[PDB]
Amino acid sequence: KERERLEEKLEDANERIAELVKLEERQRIARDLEDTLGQKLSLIGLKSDLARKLIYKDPEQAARELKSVQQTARTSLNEVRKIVSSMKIRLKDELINIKQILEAADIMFIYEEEKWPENISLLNENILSMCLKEAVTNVVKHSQAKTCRVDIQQLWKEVVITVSDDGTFKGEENSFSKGHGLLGMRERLEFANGSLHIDTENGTKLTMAIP
Amino acid sequence: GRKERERLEEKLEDANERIAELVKLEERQRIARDLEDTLGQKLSLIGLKSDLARKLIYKDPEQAARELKSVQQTARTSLNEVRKIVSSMRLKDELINIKQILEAADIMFIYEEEKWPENISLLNENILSMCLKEAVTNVVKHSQAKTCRVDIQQLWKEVVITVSDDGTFKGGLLGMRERLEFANGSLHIDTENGTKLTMAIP
Ligand SMILES: Nc1ncnc2c1ncn2[C@@H]1O[C@H](COP(=O)(O)OP(=O)(O)CP(=O)(O)O)[C@@H](O)[C@H]1O
Ligand SMILES: Nc1ncnc2c1ncn2[C@@H]1O[C@H](COP(=O)(O)OP(=O)(O)CP(=O)(O)O)[C@@H](O)[C@H]1O
Ligand SMILES: [Mg+2]
Ligand SMILES: [Mg+2]
């Protein structure tokens, strides 16, 4: 009846982790909104007040300011749908989308369909997807690969997706773009007590694990 | 036992995963809903009214400027909407804000400061706050009360905030209560003597 106390303190902690990362989500999200979006909207107000001043005397230019308000409302709307999506992907869907990305990059898509996992949640599933997006985006974008092999495997407690490629690695200890592509991926695996692994030994072999 | 009894534990850790994924899902779904709807609709509006004003410039300028007063205000309103959402993204703070709400409604604020709890998280704390907002908003707004008493109590596993008032019951609150039910806390209301609200949270 002491080891069970150990379980009450440790559980307190395994709930705490959950809340203080849901907060990662929160703050980062209000950051995007606040910044990108709100700045766009301020811009819209100012350019439309300006065009409103121009109407009578410089109309040719009021219409230009207004072409600009038009486009900033556009871009703001795209930013919104971008968020929304960063909140709404499908696994078997990402498979098709990257299938197209590489097919298009003139890269060979080796996928040997296996056992589609059962022990996976949908926060987990969506994270997995994302890491798919950035791993393939990075392969296409950099590797120099001519082949990419994607293994989705139910394995034990967790799904594992390895994304391998033959190309050469362009990465130096800076490359790890502080809070960007691969760092986003890997911190994002570390939080859900999964993990990201990379073996540059033979081209570049990526590896994602998630309960 | 340990092996068979053990595996159930799993049946429960994981049963529990399945459960709290519904807070993520339909927290982010309320959020994408608000964005999508309110905001995106506003932005479409902006595009259309500015394309229109752009057509008017030359022939009907007096009215291009009117459409444009409109684009101006819709950018405003859109920005405020973004605000609501960033803000949603403090307990002792809510205390001051409602202190003002009721003080202003000509309602008496009985608060007898107690033991500020320790066993509380901040998802919990912020939920508590919110329910404060809607309970007091509802009291001011409806009760007919002339007094409101707020008890914040560390109690056992969980903080408990009762918001009582003398007024009559005329029966927001579903948001409050489902939102307590999810964090295995609870909402209780006793209309027996005016209206007495009660929130509990681990
Ligand atoms: N498959 C690969 N082949 C060769 N080089 C690679 C590679 N994958 C990654 N790299 C190198 O490592 C660097 C770090 O990648 P990372 O994804 O962190 O930044 P990035 O350049 O992909 C933009 P983002 O911030 O969107 O990821 C890359 O810039 C690239 O130079
Ligand atoms: N403190 C209170 N005392 C007596 N009746 C109350 C009350 N708070 C709410 N009610 C009654 O219950 C109804 C439901 O409350 P609820 O909070 O869902 O709606 P509301 O009328 O407060 C506006 P909103 O839902 O937008 O906050 C109210 O219409 C009111 O008649
Ligand atoms: Mg990258
Ligand atoms: Mg109400």
Curated annotation (Swiss-Prot), chain A:
Its EC number is 2.7.13.3. The keyword Kinase applies. It catalyses: ATP + protein L-histidine = ADP + protein N-phospho-L-histidine. It comes from the Bacteria. Keywords: ATP-binding, Cell membrane, Kinase, Membrane, Nucleotide-binding, Phosphoprotein, Transferase, Transmembrane, Transmembrane helix, Two-component regulatory system. GO terms for molecular function: ATP binding; identical protein binding; phosphoprotein phosphatase activity; phosphorelay sensor kinase activity; protein dimerization activity; protein kinase activity. Residues 32-211 form the Histidine kinase domain. It is found in: Cell membrane. Residues 1-211 are cytoplasmic. Member of the two-component regulatory system DesR/DesK, responsible for cold induction of the des gene coding for the Delta5 acyl-lipid desaturase. Acts as a sensor of the membrane fluidity. Probably activates DesR by phosphorylation. This is Sensor histidine kinase DesK. It comes from Bacillus subtilis (strain 168). The lineage of its organism: Bacteria, Bacillati, Bacillota, Bacilli, Bacillales. The gene is desK. The chain holds residues 155 to 366 of 370 of the full protein.
